[PDB]
Amino acid sequence: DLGKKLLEAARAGRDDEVRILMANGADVNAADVVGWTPLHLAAYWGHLEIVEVLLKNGADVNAYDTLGSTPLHLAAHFGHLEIVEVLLKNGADVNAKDDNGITPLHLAANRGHLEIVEVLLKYGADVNAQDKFGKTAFDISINNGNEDLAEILQ
Amino acid sequence: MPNFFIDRPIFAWVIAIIIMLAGGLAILKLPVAQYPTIAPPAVTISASYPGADAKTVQDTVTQVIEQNMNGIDNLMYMSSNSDSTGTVQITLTFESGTDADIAQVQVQNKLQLAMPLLPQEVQQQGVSVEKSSSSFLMVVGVINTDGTMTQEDISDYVAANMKDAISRTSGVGDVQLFGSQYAMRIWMNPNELNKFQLTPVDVITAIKAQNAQVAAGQLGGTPPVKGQQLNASIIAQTRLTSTEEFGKILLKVNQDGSRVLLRDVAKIELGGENYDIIAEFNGQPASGLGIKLATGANALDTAAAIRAELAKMEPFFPSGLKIVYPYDTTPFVKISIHEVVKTLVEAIILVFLVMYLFLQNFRATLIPTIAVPVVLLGTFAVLAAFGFSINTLTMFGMVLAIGLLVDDAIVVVENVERVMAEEGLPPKEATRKSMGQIQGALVGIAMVLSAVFVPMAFFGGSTGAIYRQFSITIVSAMALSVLVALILTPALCATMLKPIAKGDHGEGKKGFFGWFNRMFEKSTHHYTDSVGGILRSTGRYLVLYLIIVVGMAYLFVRLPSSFLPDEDQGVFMTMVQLPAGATQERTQKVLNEVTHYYLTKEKNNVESVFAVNGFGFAPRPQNTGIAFVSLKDWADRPGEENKVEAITMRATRAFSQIKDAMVFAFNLPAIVELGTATGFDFELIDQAGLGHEKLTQARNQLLAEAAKHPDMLTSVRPNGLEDTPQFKIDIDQEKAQALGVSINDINTTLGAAWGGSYVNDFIDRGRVKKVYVMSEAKYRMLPDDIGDWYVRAADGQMVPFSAFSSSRWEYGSPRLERYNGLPSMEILGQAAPGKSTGEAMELMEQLASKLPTGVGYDWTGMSYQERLSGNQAPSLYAISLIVVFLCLAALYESWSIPFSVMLVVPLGVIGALLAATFRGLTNDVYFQVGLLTTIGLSAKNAILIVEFAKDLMDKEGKGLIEATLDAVRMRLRPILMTSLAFILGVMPLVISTGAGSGAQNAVGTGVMGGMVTATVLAIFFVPVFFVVVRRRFS
Amino acid sequence: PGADAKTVQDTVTQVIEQNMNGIDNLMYMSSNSDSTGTVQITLTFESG
Ligand SMILES: CO[C@H]1/C=C/O[C@@]2(C)Oc3c(C)c(O)c4c(O)c(c(C=O)c(O)c4c3C2=O)NC(=O)/C(C)=C\C=C\[C@H](C)[C@H](O)[C@@H](C)[C@@H](O)[C@@H](C)[C@H](OC(C)=O)[C@@H]1C
């Protein structure tokens, strides 16, 4: 009951309702049909405060959807620098692979997020990590024609 | 003019006959409908893209069409939806008075030249351009009881053996099929396809080649070899006609000679074009026809004709197939007419009894009994001339006018009966003198009442159209009543009324009538004594008048606003809303609980539950459903507990328990296009290409700020769908080109299998129907199934989708809205208790000016029209007062006296407001038109008192107080007669509990209450006004 | 072109004719489908 109310609130970005739901004992491992926890949603929609509030209320930082994607993927992909740092602080698997073999570095590189790629690298991201197509974050940077990102990954 | 027809009563009779024949002729020919055309002309462009997401539809269809909607005349605004059901609907709403045929032809013409820019798939499906309408005459439901037929089976029969015959029926405009006819459904198996190295591309290529009409030529065609004996048409390949034939379609011959047919790699059956919408009627599979009334057709005749045609189809129905009527306006429209004819007959019966009670001779009672029906019939003729229809608004327009028509009759006859009684003049000379006293006033009264009602017609938008029905009806009825009272009624009085002895006030008689005359004569002396005392202490009554004006002004604000009262129509909706990602099955489980609730707990109230899964008022996602609950007749469910109001609240409350779903019941309004009077319709607009997500954030910000003003705004909510999980799949181009797999074969294999593909047509029993190839359900359910689909490379190797694809979860819109070409989000809401709609809008505008850069706003629907129709309200109220004043000034030949009449207005309004407030009704349209008829009649009473009062002073040189007292004495009997009859005449409407009683109550309550005070107060206050006004200005 | 009257009637004439509902002042509608492939649908309207 409260779990489905947290999913909505965590996605909407309602910090006050999340606080009230954290007090009432709302399930932080509650998931939608695709396997997205409140943290997944909060990481996707870029709600920093709720990500912090969820993690300190024992939310699984390395929770994965039915396709293997973790909140760090969603945060690294949609350019949420602050959340990528807060997740990595709280023990987010930096080399986490979805079912495609795609890592948060691949996604960060794909959308040309300079700051996030450096953060992931600071926290020890396997730069030579390959997906199912044998493509590195460098291979992506060269193909996208991102000269800065290509320079960072060399 | 009265002098002319007093000497010429046969001429007068001829005019009466011509009017009656014109009226009877008009009644037989006049169209009949619940409501007339109110809403402004709208045109809906509709398209389908099988297997398309909201974004795909918007960016390939909606935007292209929108960009080409130029050079079209009298367009107010344009709105569009693009949703994941593979549907787009662009609505173009035009200026009121725009020719809907010209509006539609200009739209479809601009679309025709945009067609080459749409996808093949959309061009093939077709793009419909129709005149927008939510008003059906009835919904004919077709159900199968013995479970032998699916909804697809019923729909196909209805399409083939019903729809066309119903379309050809007399007075039937549009006919919508609730479902689709059969389609040749190829259900592909990917395991079988992979085994024979085949793809959906091969299945399509084969079906296209082996199911086609191929043009050959002729034997001995021109130019021939001269001497040719024979000229015959060459019939080559034609379209396939059966599942068996489609089964035998050759896909490949193997190396070893064995043949691969279409049946070897696919299940082949006749199915539905769409499987998204599942319709049920009390749990049983159901289709149906949505029937709309044709322009200028008779709703009663058309309904009877539709039933007569369905009766002739009864013998040919398959076993288990039954016809049901979940929605039918005809029962309502039939009662609406009977209750009006009843009111207009009862009125004449009551006038007879009142006329006899006072005047005590049958010859006198016949004159109104002739004059009123002649005027009523005449009105019908004038309605037909102006091109109006017999409908709820025009019919209740006459019910409100019966007070004015009865008065004209009473006023003329009563004044003759008095002039005879007091001066012992013969009926002829008595009528001349009687008419002499009133003829000028009746002309003045016509002009004053015209100035009251005519400006009501010149309101704009939807509300303007409604006010116009009442305006022209009441103006026409009142105008004829005056002509009849100057032509016929005089002539009838001069020839039918018998002489009365001078000073014969009926006090010489015995029994009940003798008692009454001496009792009334006493009561008349008491009245004149009372008015005598009132005219001595005027200062006090001017203070009691200002109390009434403050009390009026107070109640006017306190009384809630509405367009039309929410009536029990015998139908109401029940929304079923499951979470994002919820399936068709899960929604059906909740619909079954909703259906089960109504059929058990509301067993004595509910007749049928029409549960439509994957539907609202348009195709919705699998997570959405709706139940159209059809109730038993009002007579089979008595009291207020068995009305929609109570049933709705009880059902809505009971459905709070339901988890993993959000179920709430609600009534539909009187007319669909009005909504709520307090309600507004807001459009949040992306003006700087910000995107869907940034417009979502801006909407959330506005919804939040609106919640921080509960004092001003209530239920500020989006009229749209929230973003949902969607399966983003990325075809790697490099791996595809490296494996020799063509991107075309990949995107065809995906779209055809998973989304479905409309290939071509085939003839099933002489009807052309669609051929659809798609994956058998079990191979296109979950992401794990994606890898089971193989595409053939250039080197003939079968490559799985898993080899060249990667997938992730993302969020996206299952319904993208646009307003005037730009991305939009519709926001609904209403002014908080005790606040005006205009105030709520002003705050919504203020809160909107504090949203992110590039986020604009606009008003649409009722809000757009309320802004325009609200702008011109002051001007009409003003023009009304100025013309009324000027008309009274011409009648009395003084700038001062008019005020003596015009001061009466509040005396009628106060009682209407008290009656409506006490009863617990609303400041609705029927109430407002009721106020004008109360004001008009009370103004008529006052005009006649003041005319008599002034004429005594002017001609017989009497004093102010003397003339005034003599005037009110003469005018008491006629005022009490009209009031007694008209108050009793609308008594049934106030107490009415049955069908369409919301309108009856709204009409009668504010009229009875208004008349009770208008009558009681006017007889005491009008003399005051005349005396005070005549004093201030020498 | 190439279609016989029956084919033409099923796929064109009826498809058009069934849509010629809800037209104002339509007295009568006559049509013919030819083995030359030709369709002609004449709708005659009320006087005036
Ligand atoms: C006053 O109006 C009411 C009834 C009209 O009676 C009918 C016959 O006439 C309708 C008209 C002219 C519409 O425009 C509708 C509409 O836009 C709907 C839904 C379907 O709900 C409707 O159902 C109607 C609808 C009717 O049944 N929205 C949609 O489908 C979409 C795409 C999203 C829905 C969003 C939410 C859920 C919706 O906004 C909800 C919050 C309420 O606002 C409405 C349900 C209103 O109920 C109430 C209780 O206030 C109706 C507009």
Ligand SMILES: CCCCCCCCCCCCO[C@@H]1O[C@H](CO)[C@@H](O[C@H]2O[C@H](CO)[C@@H](O)[C@H](O)[C@H]2O)[C@H](O)[C@H]1O
């Ligand atoms: C509930 C709403 C119903 C409203 C209808 C109620 C019926 C009464 C209507 C008001 C008329 C009151 O009745 C009338 O009042 C006036 C004074 O105001 C009285 O007049 C009395 O006072 C005045 C002023 O002091 C004296 O000049 C006069 O000599 C004296 O008789 C009349 O004798 C009486 O007949």
Ligand SMILES: CCCCCCCCCC(=O)OC[C@H](CO)OC(=O)CCCCCCCCC
């Ligand atoms: C004797 C002179 C009376 C003139 C008054 C007529 C005003 C009506 C103007 C008009 O055409 O508008 C019709 C309008 C449409 O909704 O109907 C109305 O809303 C009529 C409301 C009654 C007037 C209340 C007066 C209270 C303050 C003194």
Ligand SMILES: CCCCCCCCCC[N+](C)(C)[O-]
């Ligand atoms: C346009 C304003 C019309 C007001 C009506 C005037 C009536 C005066 C009639 C005079 N009369 C017929 C008695 O000689």
